[PDB]
Design a protein around this ligand. Structure first.
Ligand SMILES: [Mn+2]
Ligand SMILES: [Zn+2]
Lengths: 219, 733, 124, 297
């Protein structure tokens, strides 16, 4: 079947504070201990596509890998076809293209009279024998920040059956992110996330999205 | 060289040596005879003693080499055809200010800079005894022949670098005798070769009877070469291992020796020696040599042969472009155009060569394809002559440099035919321990950072290379014994400001360009060599860091962060004093987590340095382009005012108060009217939490801060942000 | 008219400067009659108002702006230095002029400013 | 020679040899490679290679586009007779370094620049590396450098418009360029735009006076000697691993040295599309190096 490109678009809402975290020297500056990854020009928090891809992939390995794999080259053909496999001639690039997600509602918040788009969260640790506290500050992007989300699916050598299964995998992926967190200190309440206004659109070629859109709005 | 030529050299270097013996002796006898007689005491060479005796010119007759040495003596200084110590070069450099002078000393590796003072003008015989004996001693049992030459130079470099050419004259007061004699020899041989080529043997006619006619005659080439690709070659390491660090220091020293070996192999394919070579730089060099057809053909062919060698070994990574210009005595005090425009002909020949690099055939061959290579060298991405080394894959160059990193802590390096790292056409470079010298056969031997002449009669080179621990430990060493301090390691890159402008026209302002000579500029070059290749190591002492590249052009040092900032500051303030305020540095200082690769740090810290040059060029940039300050006020204001105040108050405060630093930071980044209110609120809140011992001092401080934050001029709050930062990094566990 | 974006903090500062100070204290400098403890329950309400101006819409919080005014006069009734503050700083007028979330948030910030400069220039 | 294809990115990675390097612009070969690869999955490879071997076919290095097109600094210019003012040395050398630092002129300024007027760079982007990790060892920790575009700076390319090309570029704008495209970088929004006369007037592929190349290009073995002798150029090295589904293993394609845009020559040359495949590889591996020029005076 013919070549086409479908764009999965949504707005990622932060349900709890998100921390991904600064490496870029600009964003590494120690004015706070544990900074968050930020877009250098706007100094706003950014959700790197690499984060989304990585997390969604390792989540989906728990479902779709028959055998648990040591290295990502050992992932199932169903994951490799979507995320890519560097050691397999067929899948050297997956069928998915992630995009860095950027803060959408900065203006909404500026209007509401929000000041910073990050909170500084104070935590501590209690020694189990001495009971003394060692305190800790770490940045989060504030909850109810929203980020414009875009993911591209390419239809090339798939049989319509195959694109259907791929769509199943993508919907499982997004739901699994919703029932997990975006990499942070997740166990301790950080990375909760929601996809709002989740929508598919054919941006190239012809494919018909009606039934997919239904299936996305219901899962 | 021919015997006649060897004798000329020694004559020219050794004339006006009487001045030293006689300054120590104080005899009422003229120096020509003091010198000449003393030379006769220690060796039998009539031609040599003759050039010492009659350098004065004294119509004894003959067409003696004396007649050469005489005219070269005159050209080697700005002057044409009661007592004071040597003058600072920076006296007549730039604006007129105080005049400073140099106490005469012998050069020691371990030593602080031999600063000029305004109170060393008066000449004293005392200072010379130390020197004259050390001279006479070392020349006592000394064969004056070809192979001895590069040792005598070093002797003159060691003892006479701060002895002035003339005790009573204001014109060349500041030109060291070492440089004057060196330059004299350069012109002596250059001249000799010119007349050899054009058949002229009546020296007494040409250089004496026609003296002023010859000064117009274009007998000289100023020649130069530039070795392109050095920084990108040294700092492009794509490995983050312990092992890969070895390659940095290695690569550095390698190419330093490449620029040297180019210099030496060139000077002896011609008939000359290192006295003909003005400077060896950041892969730059400038020579004075005869203007003949032989010499030009030897330059052209040499260059061809070298780029052949470079093509074979490094592909397009290293290239060397030569260039020359022709002149006659136009370095004697249109003088504006003339002195600048002799250097401009080579400069321009080199730029043209650098901008159209190869020929049809060598491009044809570079693009010949033909490989199918699955793997590449992990270090440099070369696919050329790969090897397995330590279960990784590297080129034979990178392998070679791994070997070199093992030979690197020796003093001596030899030039083998095939033993070691390729350094040139049928040459290689091998560091070897002293004992083993006898067991190897070698073209040439260098000794690194030794002023003492040795048994093995070696050419002396000077690299600044301080090392303390290894790069991969520097970041961890930044944490205190009490576990205090951010775990980062830093880089510094720093540069003299408008150095080009200084070398060419810094002596033009005072007088009106009468002080712009070649000699003056030579002496300038030595000042900066000395500062950057000898004295630099002392500024590094006792600090956890390594100086990887060092020169007036470029200084690169990596270490633990507090020590790198200390090193930069110590280096600069020494540099301002050394230069008497007439020249500045800019620097930038990078801050990175352990294991970031070399390429990355070098690149990002280079950007920071350019931001620093981005001010009016007197600045320093630390950790972000935003934190960029005139060096002067970073030192005076950030480092040892604001930061000392901050340190003092917060070393007293507990966790709860130390937290306010974060608020202060924020408020500094968000400077606006209302946040002045908030600033005041949390300032008085802090004052509240502060102990009553510091309550008075803190009152003063609090109101001072709000002063900085309220100034319509943003300078003080910028310095504030950066000092609070320094402090936080300084305490972090 | 009274409260402008350029205006408020400079006004707040001026008010804290013009405020009634205890000149009858030989021992004390300019020392304020006013004391943070007197304002606490008041500016707690201001802050709850600002905090809710984000999560709710203007009309929904009319009740709150009512109870603010009341408390203000009540405290100005019960404490002399309070009445002095809300006099010199035109506070009650400033409430009257709030039609708008923009205006409201500006008033909350105005209180913040007043208090900051109060503590700064000698406080509770 | 027809239209400005203006790609506008927010995030891109154009590696200059390492994943922790990145560039403002990319060259003709990169987007040609990318076009080839898009044609191949669309079905239409054979047809695209058809178009590419037409003399009419035109591709240029990407350049900054900021409220109008930019061009490369003409290498070799200004000449000595236009550059030597009477000012002191410190100034001459500051502005000489300012002239070396310069990358791209706006079109408006190119004739000025040649006639001796000074210009400095503008901020078209900020590049920074970020470190990412894989949570399975301390043995995966790496840095990727991204070019982040600022000041309404797009990149553009001059190409000869055709129905097929237009289709391939529209598709590419969801595939991304350079980059770790899978992982977030490279996507763009395309705008095909008429080419200002002020520029199109000065484009040729044959011309026997002085020209600056707009494409990183390699002359045909026959034209090479001439373009190097009377030329002024910087040689750049094209290198990398051939992307392909042919084989699991990765082979370095053949290193190729080309003349950079805009090197300048006394006259136009014919260029090549080079096959740089590893020796005995299943399929051709194409490096596009065919110049479009800009005339001088
Ligand atoms: Mn004399
Ligand atoms: Zn290598």
């Amino acid at each position: 079947m013919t070549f086409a490109k479908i764009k999965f678009s949504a707005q990622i809402r932060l349900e709890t504070g998100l921390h991904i975290g600064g490496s870029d020297a600009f964003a590494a500056i120690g004015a706070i201990d544990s900074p968050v990854i930020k877009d250098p020009i706007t100094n706003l928090p950014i959700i790197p596509g690499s984060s989304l891809k990585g997390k969604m992939r390792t989540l989906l390995a728990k479902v779709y890998n028959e055998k648990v794999a040591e290295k990502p080259s050992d992932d199932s053909d169903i994951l490799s076809r979507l995320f890519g496999n560097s050691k397999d001639k067929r899948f050297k690039m997956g069928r998915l293209i992630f995009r860095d997600a950027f803060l959408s509602n900065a203006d909404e918040l500026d209007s509401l009279g929000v000041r910073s788009y990050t909170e500084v969260k104070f935590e501590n640790t209690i020694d189990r024998i001495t009971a003394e506290a060692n305190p800790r500050q770490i940045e989060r992007a504030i909850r109810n920040s929203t980020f414009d989300f875009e993911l591209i699916y390419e239809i090339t050598d798939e049989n319509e059956n195959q694109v259907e299964e791929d769509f199943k995998v993508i919907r499982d992926g997004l739901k699994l992110l919703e029932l997990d967190y975006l990499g942070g200190s997740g166990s301790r309440g950080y990375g909760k996330v929601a996809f709002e206004n989740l929508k598919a659109t054919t941006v190239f070629g012809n494919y018909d999205v009606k039934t997919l859109n239904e299936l996305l709005t219901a899962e | 060289m021919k015997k006649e030529k060897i004798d000329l050299f020694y004559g020219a270097l050794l004339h006006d040596i009487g001045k030293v013996i006689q300054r120590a002796t104080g005899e009422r006898k003229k120096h020509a005879l003091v010198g000449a007689d003393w030379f006769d005491e220690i060796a039998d060479n009539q031609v040599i003693s003759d050039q010492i005796r009659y350098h004065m010119a004294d119509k004894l007759g003959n067409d003696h080499l004396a007649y050469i040495t005489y005219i070269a003596d005159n050209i080697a200084s700005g002057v044409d055809r009661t007592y004071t110590n040597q003058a600072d070069i920076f006296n007549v450099f730039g604006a007129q200010t105080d005049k400073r002078y140099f106490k005469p000393t012998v050069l020691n590796l371990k030593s602080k800079p031999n600063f000029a003072s305004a109170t060393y003008e008066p000449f004293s015989k005392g200072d010379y005894a130390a020197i004259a004996t050390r001279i006479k001693n070392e020349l006592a049992e000394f064969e004056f022949n070809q192979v001895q030459i590069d040792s005598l130079l070093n002797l003159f470099e060691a003892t006479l670098s701060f002895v002035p050419s003339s005790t009573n004259t204001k014109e060349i007061a500041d030109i060291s005798l070492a440089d004057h004699s060196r330059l004299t020899a350069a012109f002596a041989l250059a001249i000799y070769d010119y007349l050899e080529d054009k058949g002229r043997h009546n020296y007494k006619e040409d250089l004496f009877t026609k003296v002023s006619a010859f000064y117009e005659e274009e007998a000289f080439l100023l020649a130069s070469f530039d070795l392109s690709g050095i920084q990108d070659f040294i700092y492009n390491i794509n490995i983050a291992t312990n092992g890969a660090a070895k390659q940095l220091k290695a690569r550095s020293l390698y190419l330093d020796f490449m620029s040297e070996y180019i210099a030496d192999s060139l000077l002896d394919k011609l008939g000359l020696n290192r006295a003909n070579m003005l400077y060896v730089g950041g892969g730059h060099a400038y020579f004075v040599l005869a203007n003949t057809e032989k010499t030009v053909e030897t330059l052209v062919q040499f260059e061809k042969d070298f780029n052949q060698f470079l093509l074979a070994n490094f592909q397009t990574r290293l290239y060397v472009a030569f260039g020359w210009g022709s002149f006659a005595a136009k370095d004697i005090m249109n003088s504006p155009e003339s002195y600048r425009q002799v250097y401009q002909k080579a400069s321009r020949m080199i730029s043209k060569k650098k901008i159209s690099r190869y020929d049809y055939q060598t491009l044809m061959l570079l693009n010949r394809g033909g490989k199918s290579s699955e793997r590449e060298c992990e270090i440099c991405h070369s696919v050329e002559n790969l090897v397995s080394y330590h279960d990784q894959k590297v080129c034979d160059i990178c392998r070679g440099l791994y070997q070199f990193s093992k030979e690197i802590a020796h003093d001596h390096f030899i030039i083998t035919e095939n033993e070691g790292l390729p350094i040139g056409p049928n040459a290689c470079l091998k560091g070897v321990a002293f004992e083993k010298l006898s067991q190897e056969a070698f073209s040439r031997v260098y000794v690194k950072n030794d002023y003492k002449a040795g048994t093995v009669k070696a050419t002396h080179v000077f690299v600044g290379d301080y090392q303390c621990d290894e790069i991969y430990n520097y970041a961890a060493l930044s944490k205190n014994e009490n576990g205090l301090g951010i775990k980062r390691l830093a880089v510094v890159r720093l540069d003299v400001d408008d150095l080009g402008a200084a070398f060419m026209a810094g002596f033009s302002q005072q007088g009106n360009g009468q002080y712009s000579t070649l000699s003056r500029s030579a002496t300038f070059s030595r000042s900066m060599s000395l500062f950057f290749k000898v004295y630099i190591n002392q500024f590094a002492s006792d600090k956890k860091l390594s100086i990887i590249y060092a020169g007036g052009d470029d200084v690169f040092a990596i270490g633990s962060w507090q020590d790198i900032i200390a090193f930069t500051v110590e280096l600069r303030e020494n540099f301002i004093k050394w230069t008497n305020g007439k020249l500045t540095l800019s620097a930038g200082i990078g801050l990175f987590a352990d294991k970031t690769p070399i390429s990355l740090m070098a690149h990002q810290t280079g950007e920071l340095e350019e931001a620093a040059k981005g001010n009016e060029k007197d600045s320093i940039s630390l950790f972000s382009s935003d934190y960029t300050f005139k060096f002067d006020r970073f030192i005076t204001n950030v480092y040892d005012d604001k930061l000392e105040q901050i340190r003092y108050f917060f070393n007293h405060q507990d966790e709860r108060g130390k937290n306010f630093i974060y608020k202060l930071i924020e408020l500094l980044r968000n400077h606006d009217r209302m946040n002045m209110a908030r600033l005041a609120y949390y300032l008085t809140r802090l004052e509240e939490l502060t102990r009553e011992t510091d309550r008075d001092k803190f009152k003063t401080f609090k109101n001072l801060f709000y002063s900085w934050y309220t100034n319509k001029n943003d300078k003080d709050r910028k310095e504030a942000e950066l000092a609070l930062l320094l402090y936080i990094y300084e305490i972090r566990k | 008219t009274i409260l402008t974006d350029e205006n408020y903090v400079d006004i707040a500062e001026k008010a804290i400067l013009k405020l009634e100070r205890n000149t009858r204290n030989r021992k004390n400098p300019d020392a304020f009659f006013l004391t943070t403890s007197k304002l606490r329950n008041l500016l707690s309400l201001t802050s709850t108002l600002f905090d809710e101006s984000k999560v709710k819409e203007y009309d929904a919080l009319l009740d709150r702006i009512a109870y603010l005014r009341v408390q203000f006069v009540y405290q100005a009734g019960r404490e002399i230095a309070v009445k002095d503050l809300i006099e010199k700083a035109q506070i009650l007028e400033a409430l009257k002029e709030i039609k708008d979330r923009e205006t409201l948030q500006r008033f909350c910030r105005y209180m913040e400013a007043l208090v900051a400069y109060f503590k700064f220039y000698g406080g509770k | 020679t027809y239209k400005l294809y203006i790609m506008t990115f927010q995030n891109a990675h154009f590696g200059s040899g390492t994943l922790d390097s990145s560039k403002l612009t990319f060259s003709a070969d990169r987007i040609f490679s990318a076009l080839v690869l898009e044609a191949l999955k669309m079905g239409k490879l054979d047809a695209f290679l058809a178009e590419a071997n037409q003399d009419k076919f035109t591709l240029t290095d990407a350049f900054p586009f900021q409220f109008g097109p930019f061009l490369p600094k003409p290498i070799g210019y200004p000449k000595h007779d236009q550059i030597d003012q009477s000012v002191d040395v410190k100034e001459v050398r500051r502005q000489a370094k300012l002239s070396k630092k310069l990358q791209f002129l706006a079109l408006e300024n190119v004739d000025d620049y040649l006639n001796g007027e000074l210009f400095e760079n503008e901020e078209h982007a900020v590049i920074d590396t970020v470190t990412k990790n894989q949570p399975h060892k301390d043995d995966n920790l790496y840095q990727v450098a991204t070019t982040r575009f600022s000041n309404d700076t797009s990149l553009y390319v001059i190409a000869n418009e055709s129905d097929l090309l237009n289709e391939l570029m529209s598709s590419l704008q969801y595939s991304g360029l350079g980059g770790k495209r899978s992982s977030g970088f490279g996507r763009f929004e395309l705008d095909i735009q008429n080419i200002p006369l002020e520029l199109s007037d000065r484009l040729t592929k044959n011309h026997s006076d002085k020209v600056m190349s707009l494409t990183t290009a390699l002359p045909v073995d026959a034209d090479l000697e001439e373009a190097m002798e009377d030329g002024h150029y910087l040689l750049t090295k094209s290198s990398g691993f051939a992307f392909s589904h042919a084989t699991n293993e990765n082979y370095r394609k053949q290193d190729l040295y080309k003349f950079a845009s805009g090197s300048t020559f006394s006259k136009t040359f014919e260029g090549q599309i080079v096959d740089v495949r590893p020796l005995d590889f299943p399929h051709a591996v194409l490096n596009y190096a065919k110049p479009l020029f800009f005339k001088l005076e």
